[PDB]
Design a protein around this ligand. Sequence first.
Ligand SMILES: Nc1nc2c(ncn2[C@@H]2O[C@H](COP(=O)(O)OP(=O)(O)NP(=O)(O)O)[C@@H](O)[C@H]2O)c(=O)[nH]1
Ligand SMILES: [Mg+2]
Length: 166
Amino acid sequence: MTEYKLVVVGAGGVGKSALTIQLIQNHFVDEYDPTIEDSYRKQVVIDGETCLLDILDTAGLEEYSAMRDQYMRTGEGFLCVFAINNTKSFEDIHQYREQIKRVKDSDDVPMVLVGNKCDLAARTVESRQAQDLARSYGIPYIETSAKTRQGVEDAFYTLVREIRQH
Ligand SMILES: Nc1nc2c(ncn2[C@@H]2O[C@H](COP(=O)(O)OP(=O)(O)NP(=O)(O)O)[C@@H](O)[C@H]2O)c(=O)[nH]1
Ligand SMILES: [Mg+2]
């Protein structure tokens, strides 16, 4: 069983926890709304191979976290999350990517750009603008909704596949 260390990053309120919880939930607990950074596990079959995903749900750069740098050093792939109704969260993406490049000292870190809250009509970030940004980084772009579950599995499994193809 191959293990993968994934890190979910992005501005406050974009849905980092909602995404993580939606992927890892075994549903015993009805509602889980995390208030703190934490690590979660999910065993899943991706392309025949049993994988163990360790998913770290991180705080936005606005919050202090002592272990942030070691989180990046450890992390093997990164979900870079913004919300399609929050232009500022989208502009903030450059900060998340620079931090990862600075800590890991590499241009070629596995990453997926994630446009969350795609269930909402009040869109301020056009899909094509986010496609252009991902293309400039050389990474996949996937839109997700943590409410409907749309794209949630696809975003994490694409990140895994990015790690493998690295
Ligand atoms: N409509 C909609 N709301 C969402 C979606 N994902 C999360 N939310 C909502 O957006 C808010 C923030 O979600 P949350 O998961 O806490 O985001 P976060 O990035 O972990 N926040 P924090 O940085 O403070 O930890 C919550 O009210 C949550 O229910 C989504 O896909 N669609
Ligand atoms: Mg959170």
